[PDB]
Structure formats: structure tokens, C-alpha cells
Design a protein around this ligand. Structure first.
Ligand SMILES: CC1(C)CN=C(N2CCN(c3ncnc4sc(CCF)cc34)CC2)S1
Length: 466
């Protein structure tokens, strides 16, 4: 059921042809998510999954795409009886949305590896009957659009996806799974998640996509990996060009993570005449501040990673202290495990490796070393403060003695003469967490009291009896 106008660009013989397609779709009233996702999954399949016979670009003929498109729309139209779900006010009902979600779910293979690569697209759904977690939510939205339900939109946190719909787009519905081992709440609102101030629901500062942002999501979803070691240059270029297209049209304005993904791509392979990755990371951050009350964690993690890879130790630490400043006003809930892992890996692997190198470079005579900069020591402390504050009032603990060992080691990298220059007030720094407040005097002694530090960090009551 494609319109004659959407067919004129075919066949697609090149990356630039795919970009022309997207631009034409984006100039329309409602870009066609089904068409666009089919095309990306097709080309991703023949550039990443099976390159046999590849000479330049896998040609997307209209006969092939139209047949995929027809399989999808026939599956959805046939299995969803809209007449049974009357639409008041030109908005969808919860039962209708649940029904679409059930159709997608019931079409999927009984068993498969749910986080393999290349199972995100409608191509994967049709040819493979497999979708990853967010792919299911995207497919529900695509299905809703092809049934004419213009109110159904994709909602995205930093680690999960669902739908919004209904009067004013105010209703929420779960339509996919989260994580591994969690029992579904498909059909339900996200309101308990928002109420408990978990990271997973961003205190309600999650993204509510319009169609343009749904197009942005599928482009971010492009997966250019051929194996653990190798990426498709063709697909990295396609993703990059598509992201610039979206950028120029205003459509990454409210999409921090997309700005981050574009910055990562620019770092690897910069486009002449475009903003620096650093500028891009900073726009990502300014977008979170403007649209999502600065409640997103990844904007500052994207920045910190870049600074870490380029060994701007001071800037990396600042950025991570910034990520802790955001997290401190959340409660660590069951299901926030991915963010816990990111923080754990930063504190207990990434920072220690950076500081160990810095200590060698210092022994080798560096000037302006992070280890001689009290502002760097304050950032480190700010990072730990936000983590301790995050833990306060949470239903599950964050810190344990495994964290404390690395804390002691990280503090020890800074001489007392540097650590003593940080002014902790009730570089100047204020602690929000009771743990770090109680630590203040230990942090500036010449010799680090390691056991004391550990006690204060884990709030473990006692030392060894014997
Ligand atoms: C700083 C980082 C550790 C590096 N990559 C990160 N991400 C890779 C890109 N990601 C994303 N990028 C665009 N859109 C979305 S929507 C979503 C939740 C599941 F739907 C994730 C995600 C996940 C975040 S965060």
C-alpha cells in the first residue's frame, strides 16, 4: 500500500539514494516508519549479516521492498480488527494498543537470543520473526501508524521503551519486556515507575516521540557491526549521513542520545565543515537541560567517554562528577541495574586505570597533571558524593566494600598537599551526601586512613572481633 510518490526514488543503489528516500519521507506529513525501517533492515542485512556478492551497495528494488511492506501490513491488518475498538475523538484506546502489542508479541519465534545484533528492524520481524526489546515497541508504533492510529507514539527512557497514546497523548502503555528475568507489565501504565523515581522512567522526564523522532530512533538503531572486531564502513557512513539529515531538519533537537551517537561517529570519522564532537556532546547536554530538566545520565557519560579516550583526565572527571550530580536525585530501584553497572565500571575500573597512568606520567615528569590539580580531586569527590546521595532513601543499597577498596586507592593517587587544597563547605565543594560529609576529615590527612574510609563508605558497623 505505498503511495505512488514514495515509489519514485526506487531502486536505491547507494547510500545517498537511501538518504534521498529519508529526506523525501521526512518532508511528508507523516513519514512512513514501516517503509523506512524495512529499507534500513534490508540494507543492514546485506551489509552486516550477509555480504556475499556485495560489490558496492545492496540494491533495494521496489519489487523486494513492496513485497516486505505488503507482508507487514497484511499481518497487522488481518490480525487487528479495528471495528472492534471504536475510536473516540480520533484517539486510540488501551485495549486497541494492547491488541497490537499482543499481535507483534505472538508473531515472534518461541525462543531466540533476545539481544543479538540486527534484530531491531521490521526486516528482522518479517524475515526472521525476531525482535529485540525496543524493536517490539518500535514495531507496535509502526503497526499503529499503518492502521491509521496517529496518536500512538514511541516513548523512550535511557534503557527502555514503551508507547504513549490517547487523549492529548497523555496515556502510557508497556508493550515490551525490560531486561532479563523481569516479569512483564504489558498493558499497564509507567506511573508506578515514575512515582518511585527510578532511573528507568527518568522521573517522567522521558522522551515522547513525534514521528520525526521515531525516524531518528530507527537511525540510531542502525547497527553497523559485522562481528566483535569489524564494522561496516557503509553502514557507519549511512547512519552518520542520516543523523546529519535529521540534525539539519531540527529533528535531533529533543534527542540527547542521538546527538551523542552522532558525536561518537564524528570522532571516528569527521565530516568536513560540521561541528566538533565536543560541540555535539555539549548540544546533547543542553538538549537534556532544556527539554528533560537535566534528568538524563547519558549526556554527561558520552562527554566523559570522549574525554577519557583522549586522556583529558580533568575533563573526564568533571563530566563524571556531572553524571553523579544527576543520579543523586534518583532512587536506585530494581531494574536500574544497567546504570549501576556503568557507575561501577567508572569508579572501579575506568578511573583507576586513568589515575594509574597519570601517576606514571607524573613520575615521568608531567606538568599540569590531573594528580596535581585540586579541581580534579574535587571532581573525584563530587562523583562519589552523588553516588552516596543516590543511595540515600533507595530501596536497595549501592555501595559495598568492593567500592571502598578502589576509593582508597583512587584517593591515594593524590598527594596530601593537593587534597588539602580542596575547600569542603557546609576549589570549593559542598557535599550533599551524609556519607561524604562524615568523610571530610579523612580525605585531607597526609596518610589515608584506609579502614576508616571503608567504614564510612559502607557504613559497616564493626571491625574484626579477633
Ligand atoms: C554513554 C553511553 C554508555 C554510550 N552509549 C550509550 N547508548 C547507546 C545508544 N542508546 C540509545 N540511543 C538512541 N536512542 C535510544 S532509546 C534507548 C532505550 C531503549 F530503547 C536507548 C537509546 C543507549 C545509550 S550510553
Amino acid at each position: 500500500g505505498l503511495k505512488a510518490a514514495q515509489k519514485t526514488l526506487f531502486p536505491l543503489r547507494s547510500i545517498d539514494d537511501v538518504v534521498r528516500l529519508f529526506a523525501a519521507e521526512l518532508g511528508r506529513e507523516e513519514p512512513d516508519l514501516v517503509l523506512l525501517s524495512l529499507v534500513l533492515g534490508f540494507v543492514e542485512h546485506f551489509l552486516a549479516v550477509n555480504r556475499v556478492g556485495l560489490t558496492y551497495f545492496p540494491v533495494a528494488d521496489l519489487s523486494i521492498i513492496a513485497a516486505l511492506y505488503a507482508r507487514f501490513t497484511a499481518q497487522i491488518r488481518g490480525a487487528v480488527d479495528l471495528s472492534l475498538y471504536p475510536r473516540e475523538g480520533g484517539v486510540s484506546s488501551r485495549e486497541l494498543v494492547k491488541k497490537v502489542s499482543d499481535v507483534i508479541w505472538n508473531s515472534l519465534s518461541r525462543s531466540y537470543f533476545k539481544d543479538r545484533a540486527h534484530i531491531q528492524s521490521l526486516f528482522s520481524f518479517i524475515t526472521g520473526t525476531k525482535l529485540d526489546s525496543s524493536g517490539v515497541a518500535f514495531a507496535v508504533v509502526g503497526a499503529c501508524q499503518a492502521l491509521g492510529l496517529r496518536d500512538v507514539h514511541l516513548a523512550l527512557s535511557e534503557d527502555h521503551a514503551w508507547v504513549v497514546f490517547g487523549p492529548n497523548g497523555e496515556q502510557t502503555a508497556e508493550v515490551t519486556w525490560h531486561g532479563k528475568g523481569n516479569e512483564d507489565r504489558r498493558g499497564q501504565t509507567v506511573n508506578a515507575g515514575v512515582a518511585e523515581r527510578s532511573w528507568l522512567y527518568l522521573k517522567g522526564s522521558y522522551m515522547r516521540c513525534d514521528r520525526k523522532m521515531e525516524v531518528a530512533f530507527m537511525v540510531c538503531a542502525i547497527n553497523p557491526s559485522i562481528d566483535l572486531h569489524t564494522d561496516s564502513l557503509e553502514l557507519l557512513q549511512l547512519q552518520q549521513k542520516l543523523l546529519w539529515l535529521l540534525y539539519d531538519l531540527g529533528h535531533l533537537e529533543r534527542y540527547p542520545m542521538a546527538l551523542g551517537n552522532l558525536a561518537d561517529l564524528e570522532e571516528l570519522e569527521p565530516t568536513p565543515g560540521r561541528p566538533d564532537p565536543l560541540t555535539l556532546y555539549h548540544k546533547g547536554i543542553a538538549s537534556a537541560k532544556t527539554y528533560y530538566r537535566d534528568e538524563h545520565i547519558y549526556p554527561y557519560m558520552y562527554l566523559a567517554g570522549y574525554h577519557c579516550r583522549n586522556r583529558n583526565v580533568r575533563e573526564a572527571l568533571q563530566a563524571w562528577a556531572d553524571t553523579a550530580t544527576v543520579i543523586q536525585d534518583y532512587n536506585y530501584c530494581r531494574e536500574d541495574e544497567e546504570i549501576y553497572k556503568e557507575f561501577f565500571e567508572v569508579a572501579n575500573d575506568v578511573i583507576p586505570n586513568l589515575l594509574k597512568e597519570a601517576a606514571s606520567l607524573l613520575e615521568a615528569g608531567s606538568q599540569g597533571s590531573a594528580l596535581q590539580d585540586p579541581e580534579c580531586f574535587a571532581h573525584l569527590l563530587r562523583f562519589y558524593d552523588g553516588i552516596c546521595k543516590w543511595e540515600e532513601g533507595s530501596p536497595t543499597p549501592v555501595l559495598h566494600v568492593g567500592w571502598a577498596t578502589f576509593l582508597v586507592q583512587s584517593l591515594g593517587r593524590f598527594e596530601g598537599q593537593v587534597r588539602q587544597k580542596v575547600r569542603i563547605v557546609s576549589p570549593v565543594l559542598t557535599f550533599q551526601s551524609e556519607k561524604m560529609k562524615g568523610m571530610k576529615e579523612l580525605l585531607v590527612a597526609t596518610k589515608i586512613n584506609s579502614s576508616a574510609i571503608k567504614l564510612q563508605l559502607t557504613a559497616q558497623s564493626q571491625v574484626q572481633m579477633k
